[PDB]
Subunit: 215 residues, 4 copies
Amino acid sequence: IMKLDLQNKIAVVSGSTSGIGLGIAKGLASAGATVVVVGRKQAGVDEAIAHIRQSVPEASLRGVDADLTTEQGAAALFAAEPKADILVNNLGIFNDEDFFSVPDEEWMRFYQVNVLSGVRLARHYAPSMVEQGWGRIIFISSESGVAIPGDMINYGVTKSANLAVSHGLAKRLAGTGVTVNAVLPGEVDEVANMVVYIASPLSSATSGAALRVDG
Amino acid sequence: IMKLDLQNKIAVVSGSTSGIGLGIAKGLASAGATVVVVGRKQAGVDEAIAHIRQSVPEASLRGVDADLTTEQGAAALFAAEPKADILVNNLGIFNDEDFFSVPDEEWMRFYQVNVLSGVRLARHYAPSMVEQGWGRIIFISSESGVAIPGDMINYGVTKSANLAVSHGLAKRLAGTGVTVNAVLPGEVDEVANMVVYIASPLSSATSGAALRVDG
Amino acid sequence: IMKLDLQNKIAVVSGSTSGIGLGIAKGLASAGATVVVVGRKQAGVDEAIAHIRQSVPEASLRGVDADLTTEQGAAALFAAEPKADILVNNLGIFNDEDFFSVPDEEWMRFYQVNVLSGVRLARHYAPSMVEQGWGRIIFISSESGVAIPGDMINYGVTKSANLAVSHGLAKRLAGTGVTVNAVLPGEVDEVANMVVYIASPLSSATSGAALRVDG
Amino acid sequence: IMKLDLQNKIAVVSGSTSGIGLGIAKGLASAGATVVVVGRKQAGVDEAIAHIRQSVPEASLRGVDADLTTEQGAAALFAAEPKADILVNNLGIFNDEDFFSVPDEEWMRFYQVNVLSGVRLARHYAPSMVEQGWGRIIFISSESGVAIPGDMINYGVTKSANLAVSHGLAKRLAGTGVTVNAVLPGEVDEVANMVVYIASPLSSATSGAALRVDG
């Protein structure tokens, strides 16, 4: 007598060539999903796929070398992978430039890279999820999003913007089989476990939430 | 390739003879734990165990007929079940008496029944969890705890008090292997799935959180 | 051209013989209200009234020597001061006893002293406020109420319980002229300024809020 | 014996030619400040100044006809009004376009109009505030910012982004005499009363907060 995290589903994970994204990809692969590793450089994609195979032997893995911060990379991903049952928004940049030194262009660029990329991926993949009556959309945002640090104001603003995006799209997709949730990290596999549970069919009564996986 | 919710652990669940508590007990049993069903009347305990066996055939189930709102019932439970790896605080009462009609005795009784019972169970079972280096303590509190309704002020106060209890004991037990979390319901098995994941060894990086399982 | 914080109103403040309560009393007195200083010992009440007069010369001040933690002291206060336009709940105790050492009696006593005292005062003074169509009820709760520390679990539980009380009674008294709000301190006159604004007729569109006055 | 909201200070208020902004301007003027009314059309600026004078007779009022959403309008405002002791960020647009119909350009435009305009004004006016050791920066954001509606996802994202901006810049300007706070409306003068108190020297121990003025 046990309970399972199991998939015959397709899961795309942005920025999955390193760190938390790679751990999420490896966990979803170990759960039996078809995981799409997406990075700007094909070399990093290949090395991430190899790392995943090291741990999960019979892993179901594809790769797309694209820059999801731009519309061109998003279109390339949509061409190679038109359908996703699980979307994991994890691509994001970060600096610590002082508030009075960061110009308008940098604010707009951080918004376009950290927020609008996930919005693009969700806008593309959500309709088919709604049609099949089941879907999972998961935003990975740091705890800096709830309490903006003060030396990283741009980044915290983008993180809370992502939290808002996931909350609002959850309310918008309510009633369908698609859930939208955010996951907050601060042991990488421990973080990935929560993303796996959320992507699993068991998290079906959790939408518009923010789930913490800090220490 | 899949991922598991599995137990060789003992899990006691208060008020587990009906409703959300019974669903939590059934889910933990299906996950392979040894679930202790606790109710005031032994008849209800037996019927709940039978209901659980209906769905999970080889279920590992014990029962204790006790009134956990009182110290006598808590002592009886501690005599029959001295050790727990997983504790699920779910016993609680509720009315809708107008704020200006409810007297002091009723405020104190609601606090003793809804809050201090869980405090008693946690105070007893937490030390052995800390000694073995692993444990799970889970509070089931309604969404009325975050936004106190106004026609149910006593109940909402007790619910937010429970949220405070779980947050504080999580911080107190940090560094040990024991996590303390709260779960917020508003499909009973869907609620139970979150409690099962939290009770599972995978939720090991989630402590002091409030997890929603509303629609 | 200026704007005023002015009163012809009666304001009772619990635990107003020292510290934050005394500062709140002095600020409300300087704003022109009739402030009732309440403490267990008449000597402390007299010395607090004298301190207030030191700063505000033509202060409107009465005193009641009562122990508001008990029903007897509350009844004495209601006998000496049957009507209040402004109620400020500030009486509360605090220790740092370890969670596993504090017994049931101490949990119940902290609830009765820190939470039920304010509930008693509000239950008595709110109806006349609702009748005259205007009233202010203000709970003073520390920031430990939103993030329970872990070494002061009982106190944080009571503080969040008070926050719940104020939120719920605000919703219950909505539509009337009575507002219920909580004020969170961590310069005592700086704290008192917020309480004065809330007690003033200008805060009339703020009910069920938690207002911070930390550094 | 009373307490005062008084100014010899300069207060600039964006989008102050109508609605909540005009009410905030009128309240700050009645409190005795020098209020700068800023709108895109000089006709609207003049009519707003006239409306303010109708209620406060000896009002201290200047005007700037500029479009603060653009850098050109912000530079014009900074040329006409190089110094501000009080800054009130209120300029913002809003639609209800469905999430799947709103394109990238619209997301970026909403971010630039609703968020980056206030960031520009704050970046310009905050240093002189920090130099003189006293300042107030106030963001007016709707309650849609804390609970993103779902049919207005772009707008709610921008509102929570503004909340993040004010929180982070408050932490960044902590220790100086400048406070940064957000005010949440859902009787316009009732809203303006809170902004006036925050702009007043009495709100000096409140920074990084979100203050509600809904019904």
